[PDB]
From Swiss-Prot, chains A, B, C:
Membership in a protein family: Belongs to the P-Pant transferase superfamily. AcpS family.
Primary subcellular site in the record, as a coarse category: cytoplasm
Pfam families named among the record's database cross-references: ACPS
This protein's encoding gene: acpS
UniProt function note: Transfers the 4'-phosphopantetheine moiety from coenzyme A to a Ser of acyl-carrier-protein.
Keyword Lipid biosynthesis (UniProt): yes
Organism: Neisseria meningitidis serogroup C / serotype 2a (strain ATCC 700532 / DSM 15464 / FAM18)
Protein name: Holo-[acyl-carrier-protein] synthase
Compartments (UniProt record): Cytoplasm
Cystine bridges: none
GO CC, any one term: cytoplasm
An MF annotation (GO) of this entry: holo-[acyl-carrier-protein] synthase activity
């Protein structure tokens, strides 16, 4: 069954405002250590952060708790499978937290057009 | 299983124009009796209408009929759970229809960024 | 069970520019023979193309491959039922591929608000 569904919209310009405001700190707050390794070489760094920000917020909604406790930005990682499809990877605290509530899997889709970045998330079982 | 899915996006500015054109005749058309009673006390009347308009349209698509018969604006209500998350409530005629179609529950996800309000709906079983 | 999910946002302006750039060849490249046959009767030709473009991209994401091989613009058709519900129709190469992956069904929803066109897709099994 569907445990929950989630969506989030992120403006590129809002990310730009947040970058200026918090400086380095924002990305360091949103991105996981794994994600932070490749961020400096990101061809479109604004899109990179926007994608992660939308996906994690959408994730938090779909799991029904919001960014709280184990469900934290640093625990929710966005990676890609062999064919380039984006997938969630979880920190150990957050990986385990899901089992407890019976959440088996969380699917992700992301898209962008100009200033708008959209994340679509569905949690199963 | 999935009975159907639905989505709709609404511009806050479009809502403002619709209010301009029709007055409350627009709100009277889109809102349920329950919503219409509490609408005057809405802190954000434009955002209030935008959410209702998007969610109801997305609902109608998800059940595969569009606005038709019991699947009407006045039968599709949007309330909020204790945690403040939007959720659907139904006029008795629509509740009966959903049971007939074997739809067990209809999930609702909502997002907003600036001028854009987005609703995604999944009708289950 | 969910095989995968997909979403895509398309600007009408992007379609207009593509149409200017490539002329008729664009529609011929994006649309299936059935879609192309009915294209001249479209009430809003630009929206007609924009919707198909988004839906096909969202489909391709949901099946996890992106536009590649049998998962192609030519093979991914969008039609509407009697009640106006959008549905996918497949060239024989694609329906063959879907059965091989065990993908039983693929649901679709489309919406638009001014310049923004949006598609949501969920592939089951």
């Amino acid at each position: 069954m569907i445990y929950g569904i989630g969506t989030d919209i992120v403006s590129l310009k809002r990310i730009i405002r947040l970058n200026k405001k918090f400086g380095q700190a924002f990305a360091g707050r949103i991105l996981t250590p794994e994600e932070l390794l490749e961020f400096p070489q990101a061809g479109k760094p604004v899109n990179y952060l926007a994608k992660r920000f939308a996906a994690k917020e959408a994730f938090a909604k779909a799991v029904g708790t919001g960014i709280r406790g184990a469900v934290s930005f640093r625990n929710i990682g966005i990676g890609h499978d062999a064919l380039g499809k984006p997938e969630f990877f979880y920190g150990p605290a957050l990986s385990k937290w899901l089992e407890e509530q019976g959440i088996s899997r969380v699917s992700l889709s992301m898209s962008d057009e100009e200033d708008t970045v959209l994340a679509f998330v569905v949690a199963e079982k």
